Scaffold this motif. Structure first.
Motif, PDB file in Angstrom:
ATOM      1  N   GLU A  42       0.825  -1.220   0.000  1.00 46.82           N
ATOM      2  CA  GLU A  42       0.000   0.000   0.000  1.00 46.82           C
ATOM      3  C   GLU A  42       0.856   1.266   0.000  1.00 46.82           C
ATOM      4  N   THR A  54      -2.463   2.691 -13.113  1.00 47.06           N
ATOM      5  CA  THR A  54      -3.198   2.405 -11.883  1.00 47.06           C
ATOM      6  C   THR A  54      -4.466   3.224 -11.752  1.00 47.06           C
ATOM      7  N   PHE A  55      -4.380   4.515 -12.039  1.00 51.52           N
ATOM      8  CA  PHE A  55      -5.476   5.442 -11.814  1.00 51.52           C
ATOM      9  C   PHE A  55      -6.194   5.912 -13.081  1.00 51.52           C
ATOM     10  N   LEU A  75       2.377   6.348  -2.919  1.00 49.70           N
ATOM     11  CA  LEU A  75       0.934   6.322  -2.683  1.00 49.70           C
ATOM     12  C   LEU A  75       0.597   6.923  -1.310  1.00 49.70           C
ATOM     13  N   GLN A 307     -12.580   4.436   6.591  1.00 48.17           N
ATOM     14  CA  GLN A 307     -11.875   4.551   5.302  1.00 48.17           C
ATOM     15  C   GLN A 307     -11.015   5.808   5.304  1.00 48.17           C
ATOM     16  N   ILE A 309      -9.189   8.637   2.435  1.00 51.70           N
ATOM     17  CA  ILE A 309      -9.080   9.114   1.071  1.00 51.70           C
ATOM     18  C   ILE A 309      -7.765   9.848   0.949  1.00 51.70           C
ATOM     19  N   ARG A 310      -7.041   9.536  -0.117  1.00 55.44           N
ATOM     20  CA  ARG A 310      -5.864  10.274  -0.523  1.00 55.44           C
ATOM     21  C   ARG A 310      -6.005  10.709  -1.958  1.00 55.44           C
ATOM     22  N   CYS A 311      -5.718  11.987  -2.192  1.00 54.66           N
ATOM     23  CA  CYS A 311      -5.805  12.579  -3.507  1.00 54.66           C
ATOM     24  C   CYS A 311      -4.448  13.146  -3.839  1.00 54.66           C
ATOM     25  N   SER A 365      -4.898  14.070   2.378  1.00 55.60           N
ATOM     26  CA  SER A 365      -5.359  12.863   3.018  1.00 55.60           C
ATOM     27  C   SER A 365      -6.342  13.202   4.127  1.00 55.60           C
ATOM     28  N   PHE A 391      -5.337  12.104  -8.772  1.00 55.80           N
ATOM     29  CA  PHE A 391      -5.336  10.654  -8.680  1.00 55.80           C
ATOM     30  C   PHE A 391      -5.882  10.263  -7.280  1.00 55.80           C
ATOM     31  N   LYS A 393      -7.592   7.757  -4.361  1.00 56.42           N
ATOM     32  CA  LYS A 393      -7.694   6.381  -3.861  1.00 56.42           C
ATOM     33  C   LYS A 393      -8.375   6.388  -2.499  1.00 56.42           C
ATOM     34  N   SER A 395      -9.445   3.880   0.572  1.00 58.63           N
ATOM     35  CA  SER A 395      -9.052   2.570   1.116  1.00 58.63           C
ATOM     36  C   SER A 395      -9.753   2.292   2.454  1.00 58.63           C
TER      37      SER A 395
END
Length: 442
Positions: A42, A54-55, A75, A307, A309-311, A365, A391, A393, A395
């Motif tokens: 990760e 990936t994105f 990431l 959860q 979130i990371r951008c 994040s 981008f 994600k 998780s």
């Protein structure tokens, strides 16, 4: 008959690599396996090709971004406190020297100030870390500046074990809040001290004994002196040197990619005794360390707590109002955005060998609190100026269901939203303590 290890480690996320390093350093026999064709789990580091695959797999990579070798996009970019424990761990295991460390150029905190008649609206500010920085801080009214200067002077000379440095404030009996009130610090001051200097996640510390927080504030203050600009460092080329570093080190006393584990073997007392692959490989072991992805088939190993979130955002220029810094951290205290958990932004660039010269990467994040996490990061994203690409994600966040599992399968927690490494180091230290019953000593 069969292969036997003290510990088999599954995944090459940062925590797994660090723990492998410590095990190998203390003479344990280990095997490290990863299903993926790249290191990092990760916490993987991606070049352009892989970021886009990936994105944005349907898209051509823009020509303006140049060649893959300029891009090393973590990431999960977490900066590292100079005086924290990860640094001590890297020293002990002698992995430090496989990496080149560069200081993060600035530390900022969010405190909204409304437009006045003679002053512009403001959002983010340098985090003051010396008495002199406090006396001059736009975070503080004229008056509050003096009070914060006095506080920093006090902490700078404070010692947990020397009573004559306490000025008659018992830090084991008084709470941190009582110490703040002694210096007559206001709420906004308490906000950035707690969240951006003591590096806490919430205000529970206010009710706890003062010494815990004084030590942390003092540590922040001491940590600046190494490189001056901030108390945080990050490796050249990013956190991807870390799994590489640990793989190289461990090989001295090995790591294996593309190794697909398809089962745990359990003994008659339901304790782990081995692992099997899809390619008919078997090895026996006394313990396993793994990330949550390796135990998704096992009962009562992990619990989902939320959860993250990371951008990741490619920018054309530095973040506005961060003094054109080539790297920085922005801590957004939760009360500033009317929410129940902080938001964080890290910025890295060509300075740390992670982007093309002239481009920057800002990573926002957050802990997801709503049905619409993209909306939760809207205001933070507005801080960044013109964003070329995003981008995103999201998780799941897992924690382990016990600290000392009877079955000897020790599961690392998922990486949280924080922009620095402490909470990751805390988790791996807790795992270490419970593997051998003894805290790691420095």
């Amino acid at each position: 008959q069969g292969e036997h290890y003290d510990v088999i480690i599954l995944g090459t996320g940062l925590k797994e690599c660090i723990l492998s390093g410590l095990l190998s350093h203390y003479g344990k026999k280990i095997l490290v396996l990863d299903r993926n064709p790249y290191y990092g789990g990760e916490t993987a580091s991606l070049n352009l090709t892989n970021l886009y695959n990936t994105f944005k797999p349907k898209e051509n990579i823009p020509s303006k971004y140049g060649e893959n070798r300029h891009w090393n996009v973590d990431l999960i970019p977490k900066f590292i406190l100079v005086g924290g424990n990860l640094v001590k761990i890297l020293k002990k295991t002698r992995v430090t020297n496989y990496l080149e460390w560069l200081v993060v150029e600035g530390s900022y905190v969010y405190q909204h100030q409304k437009k006045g008649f003679l002053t512009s609206e403001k959002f983010i500010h340098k985090v003051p870390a010396t008495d002199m920085e406090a006396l001059v801080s736009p975070l503080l009214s004229l008056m509050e500046k003096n009070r914060c200067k006095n506080f920093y002077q006090y902490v700078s000379e404070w010692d947990a074990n020397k009573r004559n440095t306490w000025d008659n404030l018992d830090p084991y009996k008084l709470t941190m809040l009582e110490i703040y009130k002694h210096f007559n610090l206001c709420q906004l001051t308490i906000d950035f001290l707690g969240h951006a200097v003591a590096l806490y996640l919430n205000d529970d510390y206010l009710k706890q004994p003062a010494y815990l927080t004084l030590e942390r504030i003092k540590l922040y203050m001491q940590s600046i002196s190494a490189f001056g600009k901030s108390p945080f460092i990050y490796p050249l080329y990013g956190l991807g040197g870390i799994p590489e570093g640990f793989s190289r080190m461990c090989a001295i006393n090995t790591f294996m990619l593309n190794k697909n584990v398809v089962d745990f073997v359990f003994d008659d007392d339901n304790k782990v005794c081995g692992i099997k692959s899809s390619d008919g490989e078997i090895a026996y072991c006394d313990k396993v360390i793994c990330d949550p992805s390796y135990v998704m088939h096992l009962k009562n190993k992990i619990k989902k707590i939320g959860q993250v979130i990371r951008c990741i955002c490619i920018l054309s220029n530095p973040i506005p109002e961060t003094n054109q810094t080539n790297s920085c951290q922005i801590i957004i205290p939760q009360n500033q955005l009317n929410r129940k958990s902080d938001i964080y932004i890290n910025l890295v660039s060509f300075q740390h060998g992670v982007t093309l010269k002239g481009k920057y990467i800002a990573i926002v994040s957050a802990t997801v609190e709503t049905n619409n996490p993209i909306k939760e990061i809207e205001k933070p994203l507005e801080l960044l100026g013109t964003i070329e690409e995003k981008f995103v994600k999201i998780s799941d966040l897992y924690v382990s269901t016990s600290k000392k599992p009877a079955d000897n399968i020790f599961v690392t927690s998922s990486y949280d939203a924080t922009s620095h490494f402490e909470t990751a180091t805390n988790d791996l230290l807790q795992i270490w303590e419970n593997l051998w019953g003894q805290k790691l000593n420095f």
